[PDB]
Amino acid sequence: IRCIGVSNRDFVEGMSGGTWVDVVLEHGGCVTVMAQDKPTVDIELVTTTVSNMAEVRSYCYEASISDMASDSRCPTQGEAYLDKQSDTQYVCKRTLVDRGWGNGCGLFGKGSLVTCAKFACSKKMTGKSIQPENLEYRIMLSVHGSQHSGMIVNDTGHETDENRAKVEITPNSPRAEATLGGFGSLGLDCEPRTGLDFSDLYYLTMNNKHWLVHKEWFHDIPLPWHAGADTGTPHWNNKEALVEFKDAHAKRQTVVVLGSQEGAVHTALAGALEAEMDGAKGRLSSGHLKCRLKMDKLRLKGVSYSLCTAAFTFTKIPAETLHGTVTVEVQYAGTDGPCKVPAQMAVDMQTLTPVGRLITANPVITESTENSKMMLELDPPFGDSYIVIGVGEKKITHHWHRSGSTIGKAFEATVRGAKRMAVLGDTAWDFGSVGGALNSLGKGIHQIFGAAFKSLFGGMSWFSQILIGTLLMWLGLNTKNGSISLMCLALGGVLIFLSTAVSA
Amino acid sequence: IRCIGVSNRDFVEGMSGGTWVDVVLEHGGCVTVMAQDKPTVDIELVTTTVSNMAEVRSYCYEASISDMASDSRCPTQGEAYLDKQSDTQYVCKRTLVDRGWGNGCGLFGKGSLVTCAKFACSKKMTGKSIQPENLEYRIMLSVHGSQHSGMIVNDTGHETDENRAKVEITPNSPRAEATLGGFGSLGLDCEPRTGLDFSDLYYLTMNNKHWLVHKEWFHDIPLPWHAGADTGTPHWNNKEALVEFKDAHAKRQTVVVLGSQEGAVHTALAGALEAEMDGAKGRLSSGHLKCRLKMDKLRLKGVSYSLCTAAFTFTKIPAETLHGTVTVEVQYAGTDGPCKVPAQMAVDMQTLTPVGRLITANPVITESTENSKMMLELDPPFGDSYIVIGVGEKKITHHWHRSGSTIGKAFEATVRGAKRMAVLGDTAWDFGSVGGALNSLGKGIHQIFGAAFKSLFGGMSWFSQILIGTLLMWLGLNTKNGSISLMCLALGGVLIFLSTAVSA
Amino acid sequence: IRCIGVSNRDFVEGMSGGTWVDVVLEHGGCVTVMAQDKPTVDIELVTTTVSNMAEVRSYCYEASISDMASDSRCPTQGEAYLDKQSDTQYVCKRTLVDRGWGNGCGLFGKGSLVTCAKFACSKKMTGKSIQPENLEYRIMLSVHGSQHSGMIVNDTGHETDENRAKVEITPNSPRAEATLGGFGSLGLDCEPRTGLDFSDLYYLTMNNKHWLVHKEWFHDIPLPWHAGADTGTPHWNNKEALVEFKDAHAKRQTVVVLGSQEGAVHTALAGALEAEMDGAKGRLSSGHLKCRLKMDKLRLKGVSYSLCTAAFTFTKIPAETLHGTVTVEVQYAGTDGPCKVPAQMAVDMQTLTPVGRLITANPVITESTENSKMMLELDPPFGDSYIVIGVGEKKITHHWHRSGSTIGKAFEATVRGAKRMAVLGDTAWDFGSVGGALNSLGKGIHQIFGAAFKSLFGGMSWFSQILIGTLLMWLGLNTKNGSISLMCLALGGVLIFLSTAVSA
Amino acid sequence: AVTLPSHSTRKLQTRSQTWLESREYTKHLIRVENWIFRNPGFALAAAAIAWLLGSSTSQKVIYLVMILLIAPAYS
Amino acid sequence: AVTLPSHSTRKLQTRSQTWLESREYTKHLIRVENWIFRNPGFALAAAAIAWLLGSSTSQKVIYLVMILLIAPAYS
Amino acid sequence: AVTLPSHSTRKLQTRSQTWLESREYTKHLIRVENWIFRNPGFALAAAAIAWLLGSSTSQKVIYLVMILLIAPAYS
Ligand SMILES: *[C@@H]1O[C@H](CO)[C@@H](O)[C@H](O)[C@H]1NC(C)=O
Ligand SMILES: *[C@@H]1O[C@H](CO)[C@@H](O)[C@H](O)[C@H]1NC(C)=O
Ligand SMILES: *[C@@H]1O[C@H](CO)[C@@H](O)[C@H](O)[C@H]1NC(C)=O
């Protein structure tokens, strides 16, 4: 029931050959599953919490100078001193002043003074370091049993039940076993490691608006610094990028506190992930996790019930959703037990051969004596169908129409893979739940590319990569030969694509 | 253990069946060894003290001119004689203080002046001399076999050494012996008598900070000599290298001692290995030594154990070192005494296939009561996989992953093969047991050129060899006539490479 | 008189001006000048004394460490902080050591570590500044005539006696003047601003010896410094160029305070000048000074002196001074009043015909009764000649021979007019002469080819010169046309000259 | 601050949107023209230099862009 | 006075820091800078002093350079 | 390091013979002796590169010494 309308649900076609549900849960859209031998369940990598972290560095984005102390010496001596150049508590800078007879200096010109400022700090950007291991996910999964718009909504009351289960692979307990009886169990062979490589993913905290930020970029911006440090009296580091030493004309040396940078770190912070914190753990979103489930332990309860006969009614008129999978919600006569609810949406009426698919799998009234509104799916074949769900005397038929030809689906489910590729790089040849030659050869061929093409182009935001691709496509057909100039308009065709392919 | 994380550490896995594996081992970390049924072991050349040695030459670095007496004859009135001029202690000149009537002479010309100074030393440096013998080597053997998580560094018990037994390879006893807890005792047949060169080497002893200095150099410092030890005040050859007195045309004999010479020496010793001669016997850290392991006595233990079943709670989390290995410290919930507990590199599906190697040869629980620590060093395959521990059904796996490249290790037995090589010349191609005469090369072909290189550029230094090397790496990109090309840009690049390797 | 024999005492019988004639009276020897009629005088740059000197730096050549401390950090916790880092009186170096199971957390890898030693200086070495002011030059004035028994050196009542004259000239008062009652006065006005190069010359002191050093050298010494003056722990700069951080093969990083740099500097100074110290006044030798000693107001004490009657008994065999100037030490035992010593030179004496030219022109004796003594020069002619007294059947006639060569001695003022050339370098035309063409210009073509010739070869210590002077003189012999095959021969061999006019 | 490096350069490809893609691509445009709409002159001049090159009727082409693309954003 | 020994010439090759190695590789240099900056004059000097009788394209440099490598030290 | 640089550069040329002078005349020459004497092998290696450059009769003569004297001083 979950994953229906997640604008990005993906029906993983089973396989009548051992359970290889190799699916990459997205932390966003989702993936449902279907094989003859089992009801149909789906998963949505809901929460992706990070346990503990290290306070690698702390930066200050709003310093505050306090005491402006200035010292001077004329060409008569070498430099200046000034009481404060012997403290970390300040920040000094020495240079010259046209020291002349203005001050009564024997010699003329050449002086050298030094002004200082006591360097306090207003708000500090407390970054972090989260080892790949110690984190953890929480993939909840549901099943198309008898649900009733019980979809999404409440989740905790639903997990103490047979159709909605919540498992959680740790990089330590990587094979959780979601046991939703009345059906069975579930295997999970997850890689709580090849996630988002939180290796180089320092977790930021800029005034309770934290974003998971790339490592590099973290060290790279300089301002103040203090870290792996017992706060105590924060002996800073740097500080130039805040106290501004500009001597008015050439007689006096003034120093202003350059402005906060508060939001100039928000424009800096133009990366991708947005994080949420509890304080305890690093609760977040936007990530991915590759697993493998065990289909073996999952019983189709339904095929044991006597199909239900009596009345049926569309409490909720059929709604087509995200590419041609229709939900119908219906209720029952009102004096029955746990029995199947017949339903074959067909071509016609008389020769009602069942044509199309039954996402739902096994639809069965819950052992109820009340009008059970069982909410269940179906995949109409492109064109005109008849979601007919009943005994046959009283077929609560319906006229349906799926506007998607099969060719127009292949072209548009080509992208449901085009993006799940360019967002999952090579972990894209992982949806290929099997040990195929090409599902395997791929993860490998488009491997010395994920590695190459990325290393030599892993530094350029949207705009920046079109500006290269388009330059490459010109280097394309336009050049001396069509030999080593095809791969130019080729890889140059990737960049132009990758930029626009992430957007839509 | 001893080497679960020391950058230097090299692995000699020679199941040569030669019951030996020549293996070079210095104070540069260590080596582990493993082969058929042989509990992988760690050898670590720790200490290499020099016992009895006596001084060769003592230098003065802190002169101290006592009194200065002097006499000047008048022009051809004879000559200036000073009774000291004969007593070795002082040191004087025979200048020409021009003099005449004003100067008290009955004539105009160059009467002669001899200014004498009594010389004395304040602090010196003696060059105790060391020979092959008076040398004692301290190797530390430790077998992964089955041990402790924290106690992999504890080094106090060499009586309980079920693994970590301290050897003591003397020069007079090249051969050795090891004692274990049910393991064969080991024998390393070495060459303390010729390990690291010592003929060309002494112990400077100034200020209490000593350091192993070359021989060549130590016979050319320009200070006052003192051959033999002291009988209190001694006689110094070159009592003037320090003493300096230059009077110009006047009667004023300026005898300045010249100061100290610490920096003057510390500074000119930037290639000398720091050494701490402590108490009686000088200790040399940072040596080098070439042995060989006699692998007969060492035969696995606890092989006759039953593959123990209880679940295993990793006490900590699966780490990696600079070699892709993995500490995997687990627990055994109280099911009987000693037994084996197997693991596998579960390359994905359940427990099915065993992959990658396991560095610890055989893991064995030696504890009879409850829970106890043990850690297996594995060699996870270049890609992903888990870590099965215990047995099949009640097995806990921890997800793991190893990055880099299959041919990223070929960029390491090669880069580590420039250190092993460029810090031991030809006595470097000695890590892997003689595989025939195929080695009458890697430890031959080098004493053919290297011994000719010893002379040729033997006397260089960083900066130096580049300008003497780069000019070569250039000459070879510009050889007008000959085969010079190939040997040129080679002998050029390799030099500059030798420097751009170890410690630079 | 004053300089009856000092290596480098030159004459200027050629005042050649309307009583105006210059000279460069250096610390090196002296000069005697005698105009057509004027008494003859001996001036000399006896001493010079800087006065106030503002110390610029206070280099430290002996560092002493303590409070050795340190801290580490597992490869996860970011940096490593140690409170002494906020001490500024402690030096540190943070560097990644090694660790893991066996040392800290367990997560393997090269985490970070820092260690902080304390600091302090055992012996510093200030460098006081010298400004073209505060340098009173001393100059001694000793006339001739009435002057006996080398009562010359004897520097007493250098005031009372008019035969001696103390003349101190400050740069703010160069026009000084000698009061020689009887011989008149001596008008002198020098160049205290353009003597030695006081601008650029600091003044240092290790222990107590004092030097003179060129600025560059003084500001290009790694040694931990303290600038200007300050009583508290001179906040040291470069507290680390004299401290060392040993990198342990693995785990540690311990400091090792380099040893006393005394003799290291005490040797670097080679190329500097020695300088004493009297009180606070920076007394020094070796200076040189220019001047325009006006010959007016000078008069022969006695032009109206009856010739001394009859005792030419000289109590000294008339020795001879270098450069060819016989000195006699007559004593008029039988004589009276202040009469004119009837001296004179005679080539034959057969019939008094002088050919000398004594330079102590107008020798006189005062309070002369008996016991009267007195000295007097003489330029003996080439070959034979008899010194003499005018009249007397007791007219002494000590035969005298003049060695050398008439035109021989000429070759001398070419290789001596050269010493004054190499040293002084260009202020070497300001010897004794009023100039106009080949004398005003000599400078004009020297000042230009003095600066040019400085810029492209200053920095060339001695051994340098010749090298880049011989291997240069070759380029001139090679090639052709002269314009570039002479200029390279000239400046090639002449470069060499300022190498032989140095130590010789 | 002085130099601020972009976390843009190294984003993090995920299905969930970046910190602020929106207002991202519109800025570079804004600047690189809100620059030529101020110091437009640099256009005609900048153009000349784009002429003094391999003047390929398809090369001068690029160069012209290489200059106007850099001026705007100081590099 | 001159302590002409330079053990850093006779290095020992081990798994350790040859005494004061830290700033070894750098030193030899910064004294060629402390030289030329204070003696900029010699800059052009060894430009032709070498150029002349360099007898080649590159040779000029291997002179100009192997000269500006004497002055700093042996001088 | 702790090179306490070159005062031999600027010698306050005068009358009274500079500091430690008497020495300096030979000193920079000795360092370059105690050096070859040790590792002479820098023979077939030093004289070598000579024929390698320029080839002029008087080339190696000055090339071989160009390096022979730079060998030390940088040892
Ligand atoms: C709300 O949750 C409860 C159980 O916790 C469930 O019985 C009910 O059907 C849910 N209602 C919704 C929102 O579907
Ligand atoms: C060393 O061995 C002792 C044996 O009593 C053990 O208790 C201790 O934990 C070990 N020391 C270390 C390094 O932990
Ligand atoms: C210096 O000369 C004076 C004058 O005759 C004499 O009285 C004094 O003792 C002399 N001093 C010396 C140098 O002995």
DSSP annotation string for B186-216: PEE---TTTSS--TT-EEEEETTEEEEE-HH
C228 touching A (Cβ < 8 Å): yes
> What is the bridge-based pairing of β-strands B10-12 and B31-35?
parallel
Tell me, yes or no, whether chains A and F touch by having 3 or more C-beta pairs under 8 A.
Answer: no
From C379, C56, E1, select the one nearest B261 (Cα to Cα).
E1
Within 10 angstroms of residue F29's Cβ, the number of other Cβ atoms is 13
Method: cryo-EM
A 10 A CB-CB count for A178 gives 23
Question: Which residue puts its alpha carbon closest to atom 14 of ligand 3?
Answer: C154
CA–CA gap between residue F28 and residue C414 (Å, rounded): 31
CATH number for the domain formed by residue range(s) A1-51+131-198+279-300: 2.60.98.10
Residues of A whose CB is below 8 A from D16: 27-28, 272-274, 285-286
CB contact under 8 A, B246 and F4: no
CB proximity E52 to F under 8 Å? no
Q: B103 contacts in C (CB within 8 Å)?
A: 153
Residue B23, classified by CB atoms within 10 Å of its CB into exposed (0-12), middle (13-18) or buried (19+), is buried
Gap between the Cα atoms of F30 and F52, Å rounded: 28
C209 Cβ under 8 Å from any chain B Cβ:
yes
Instruction: Give the closest residue (by CA) to ligand 1 atom 9.
Output: A150
> How close C265 gets to chain B, by Cα (Å)?
8
Strand partners, C325: C321
What CATH architecture applies to the domain C52-61+124-130+199-234+260-278? 2-Layer Sandwich (3.30)
**Distances, alpha carbon A351 to alpha carbons A348, A390, C56, in Å:** 6, 15, 109
The whole-angstrom separation of Cα B486 and Cα B494 is 12
Ligand number nearest CA of C156 is: 3
- Cα-Cα-Cα-Cα torsion C170, C171, C172, C173, nearest 10 degrees, comes to 60
Q: Is A133 exposed, middle or buried (0-12, 13-18, 19+ CB in 10 A)?
A: buried
Provide the token pair at E4: 């002409």
Nearest CA in chain C to A232: C83
In sequence order, the β-bridge partners of residue B110 are B98
Closest by CA position to E28, among listed F2, B286, A104, C213:
F2
- DSSP string covering C221-283, please? --S-B-BS--SSS---BSTTTT--EEE-SSS-EEE------HHHHHHHTTTSEEE--BTTBEE
Is there a contact between E62 and F53 if contact means CB atoms under 8 Å apart? Answer: yes
Atom of ligand 2 nearest to the CA of B154: 13
What are the extents of the domains in chain D?
1-75
Identify all chain A residues contacting D28, using CB atoms and an 8 Å cutoff: 463
Measured at the CA of A477, the angle between CA A472 and CA A479, to 5 degrees, comes to 85
Q: Distance (Å, rounded) from C-alpha A177 to C-alpha A168?
A: 9
| C-alpha to C-alpha distance for A272 and A350, rounded to whole angstroms | 56
Give the other-Cβ count within 10 Å of C488's Cβ. 22
Tell me how far apart the alpha carbons of residues B219 and C234 are, in angstroms, rounded to a whole number: 40
Interface test with E, best of B242, B455, B463 (most E CBs within 10 A): B463
DSSP helix/strand/coil, B264: helix
Whole-number Å distance, alpha carbon B373 to ligand 2 midpoint, is 13
Residues of C in contact with B257 (CB under 8 A): none
Ligand nearest to the CA of A157: 1
Helices marked H in C262-394: 262-268
| Residue A191 to residue B401, Cβ atoms within 8 A | yes
In angstroms, what is the span from residue A84 Cα to ligand 3's centroid?
60
Q: Residue F49: phi, psi to the nearest 5?
A: -40, -20
CA of A158 to the centre of ligand 1 (A): 7
Both tokens of residue C125?
Answer: 């070495």
* CB-based contacts of A188, cutoff 8 Å, min separation 6: A139, A167, A169, A174, A175, A176, A177, A178, A291, A292, A293
Tokens 């005491």 map to which residue? A67
B150 Cα–ligand 2 center, Å = 8
> Residue A11: which of A28, A29, A27, A34 has the closest Cα?
A34
Q: What 3-state DSSP class applies to C219?
A: helix
- Chain A residues close to B314, C-beta within 8 Å: 172
For residues B4 and C102, what is the distance between their CA atoms, to the nearest angstrom?
Answer: 8
Tokens 């400004």 correspond to C131
Residue C156 CB less than 6 A away from ligand 3:
yes
Which residue's CA is the nearest one to ligand 1's atom 5? Answer: A157
Structure tokens at A174: 């990587």
> Is residue B350 within 8 Å of B334, Cβ to Cβ?
no
In sequence order, what are the residues at sequence separation of 6 or more whose Cβ sits closer than 8 angstroms to the Cβ of residue B64? B119, B120, B121, B122, B257
Q: Taking a C-beta distance cutoff of 8 angstroms, is the pair B68, B325 a contact?
A: no
Name the amino acid, one letter, at A274.
E
Rounded distance between C-alpha atoms, residue C396 and residue C357, angstroms: 18
Distance CA B235, CA B58 (A): 11
For an interface test with B, the pick among E6, E7, E26, E68 (most B C-beta atoms closer than 10 Å) comes out as E7
The two tokens of residue C249 are: 């093969």
Half-sphere exposure of A396 (CA within 13 A, CB side): 21
- What token pair was written down for C121? 């200086």
Cβ-based contacts of B254 with chain C (< 8 Å): 274
Q: Are D1 and A261 in contact (CB under 8 A)?
A: yes
- Expressed in angstroms and rounded, the spacing between residue C153 Cα and the centre of ligand 3 is 10
Q: From CA B75, how far away is CA B93, in angstroms rounded?
A: 17
- Cα separations in angstroms, A160 against A46, A165, C395, D20: 17, 8, 147, 38
Query: Which of E40, E49, E52 is opposite residue C468, by nearest beta carbon?
Result: E49
Q: Is C340 exposed, middle or buried (0-12, 13-18, 19+ CB in 10 A)?
A: buried
DSSP 8-state code for residue C404: S
Picking from B245, B256, B244, F19, the residue whose alpha carbon sits closest to that of residue C274 is: F19
Which fold, C405-504? Monooxygenase (1.20.1280)
A77 in contact with ligand 1, CB cutoff 6 A: no
CA B156 to the chain's CA centroid: 24
Do residues C136 and C45 touch, judged by C-beta distance below 8 A? no
b/e sequence B86-119, b meaning 16+ C-beta within 10 Å: eeebbbbbebbbbbbbbbebebbbbbbbbbbbbb
Please, what CATH class does the domain formed by B62-123+235-259 belong to? alpha beta
* C-beta atoms of C213 and F7 within 8 A: yes
CB contact set of B108 (below 8 Å; sequence gap of 6+)? B75, B98, B99, B100, B101, C5, C319, C320, C321, C322, C327
Residues present in chain D in total:
75
* Nearest chain D alpha carbon to A8: D15
Q: At the fourth CATH level, which superfamily is domain E1-75?
A: Flavivirus envelope glycoprotein M-like (1.10.8.970)
Query: Which H or E run contains B59?
Result: strand B58-60
E9 touches chain F (CB under 8 A): yes
Question: Helix (H, G, I), strand (E, B), or coil: what is residue A182?
Answer: coil
Packing angle, helices F21-34 and C462-477, rounded to 10: 70
Task: Report the candidate in B3, B322, B300 with the shortest Cα–Cα distance to residue B140.
Answer: B3
Q: Could you give the 3-state DSSP secondary structure of residue C201?
A: strand
Where is chain C discontinuous (C–N over 2.5 Å), named by the preceding residue? none
Half-sphere exposure in the Cβ direction for B359 (13 Å, CA): 28
Q: Is C5 in CB contact (< 8 Å) with chain B?
A: yes
Report yes or no: A491 and A471 within 8 Å, Cβ to Cβ: no
Cα(C90)–Cα(C65) distance, rounded to whole angstroms?
9
- According to CATH, the topology of domain C301-404 is Immunoglobulin-like (2.60.40)
Give the residue ranges of DSSP H helices in chain E.
24-36, 42-51, 61-67
Dist CA C29 CA C285 (whole Å): 11
CA distance C324 to C305: 29
Judged by 3 or more CB pairs under 8 A, whether D touches C is no
Residue B138 DSSP SS3: strand
How many angstroms separate the CA atoms of E43 and F63, rounded? 20
Q: What is the dihedral of CA F65, F68, F72, F75, to 10 degrees?
A: 140
Reported as type and span, the H/E element at residue C23 is: none
Q: What are phi and psi of F38, to 5 degrees?
A: -75, -70
Which chains form contacts with chain D, at 3 or more CB pairs under 8 Å? Answer: A
Provide the H-helix boundaries in C292-404.
none
Q: Which residue, A364, A398, A368, A366, is CA-closest to A384?
A: A398
Which residue is closest to C84 within chain A, CA to CA?
A: A235
User: Distance between CA atoms of B197 and B134, rounded to whole angstroms?
Assistant: 13
Reported as type and span, the H/E element at residue A463 is helix A462-477
Of the candidates B263, B458, B475, the beta carbon closest to that of F39 is on B458
Mutate to test the pocket of ligand 2, among B4, B142, B149, B151 (most ligand atoms within 8 A of CB): B151
Cα–Cα distance for residue pair A285/A293, rounded to 1 Å: 22
H/E stretch holding A120 reads strand A120-121
Report which protein residue has its CA nearest ligand 2's atom 9.
B151
